[PDB]
Structure 1
Amino acid sequence: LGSSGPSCKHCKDDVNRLCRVCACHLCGGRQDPDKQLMCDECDMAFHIYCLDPPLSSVPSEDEWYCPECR
């Protein structure tokens, strides 16, 4: 993966692994990247359906903070 190597140190950009660092911080699942919100503080991803309560869709706000950060 070149000079910088993998973007993610934890999974090494292996798409066949679950990863709670570069994919959903709750379940590690890579599916539905379009429904994973990025926290504007910690930059972790979260499936709308992994949150509690689950969100139906992507919020229409300027920013979003995850449960760990908010």
Structure 2
Amino acid sequence: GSKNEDECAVCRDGGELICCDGCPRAFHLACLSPPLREIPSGTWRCSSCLQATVQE
């Protein structure tokens, strides 16, 4: 187990994806509800883990 499931939680495919610290999910940046454009500073959570009101 390394670098999440190595798959975009929106495409189920590959490419450059960002791993979530709250769960084993990766995203195509723009594939996120809110697009990163420039990857977070340090840690990061996906929309869901983000709804939890934690962030990073």
What interval of TM-score do these two structures reach, taking the shorter chain for normalisation? 0.5 to 0.7
> TM-score, with normalisation over the residues of structure 2?
0.65
Instruction: Name which structure has the greater RCO, CA cutoff 8 Å, separation 6+.
Output: 2
Cα RMSD, aligned residues only: 1.7
Gaps of 5+ in 1: 1-6, 8-20
1:22 deviation in Å?
3.4
Report how many aligned residue pairs link the two structures: 47
Larger Rg: 1
**1:38 correspondence with 2:19:** yes
User: What pairs with 1:1-70 in structure 2 (closer than 5 Å)?
Assistant: 21-31=5-15, 33=16, 36-59=17-40, 61-70=41-50
Displaced runs of 4+ in structure 1, greater than 4 A? Answer: none
**What is residue 14 of structure 1 aligned with on the other side?**
none
Q: Name the CA distance, whole Å, in 2 between partners of 1:54 and 1:41.
A: 18
Gaps of 5+ in 2: 51-56
Letter in 1 for 2:21: D
